[PDB]
Amino acid sequence: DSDIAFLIDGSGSIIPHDFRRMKEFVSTVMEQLKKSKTLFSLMQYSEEFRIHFTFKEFQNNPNPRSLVKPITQLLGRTHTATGIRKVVRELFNITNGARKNAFKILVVITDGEKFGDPLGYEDVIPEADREGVIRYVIGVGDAFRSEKSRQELNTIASKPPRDHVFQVNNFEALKTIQNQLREK
């Protein structure tokens, strides 16, 4: 009943310690939701974009370790808004294994410093709402330490922000998603 896509920040500002933590966060969400009706898909972005697995590819090989282990960090600039547009148009496409009546969830993992993107969040967030995608944001590094990055996380997340913005250092986001999925 639910299709969950990950969009993870592989840009130069993300230190390898945090990138590693993104990989274990994503893997743990998948591992915890195994034996459920959830499909998973993941894109890494910087100034380039890498689909590491589609929903269909997860369905054919639902092994979180096998799917996430070979992921290496892109480095480069931070095109978060374009990444969101590509997730919506490509990952949640039926050609890639996305399902018609599935509950759509996007989990964006970033430090909240979009940089060099020709697109603004105003260019892509409406499209995300148009396709019914629920957006959770997982902050990393110093995302919560300045007002600019805090507000950027809020801008990406579905409303209200306090229900959709979380940290990579814990699994509160997973608890919330599990609760949402249970209720739904």
Ligand SMILES: CCC(C)(C)C(=O)O[C@H]1C[C@@H](C)C=C2C=C[C@H](C)[C@H](CC[C@@H](O)C[C@@H](O)CC(=O)O)[C@H]21
């Ligand atoms: C891009 C060519 C340019 C501007 C001439 C240059 O000399 O560029 C330097 C100077 C500085 C002002 C701005 C830069 C922008 C991108 C380059 C990866 C580089 C490193 C800063 C960058 O690593 C900061 C991270 O935040 C990247 C990201 O995560 O988006 C850095």
Ligand SMILES: [Mg+2]
């Ligand atoms: Mg960056």
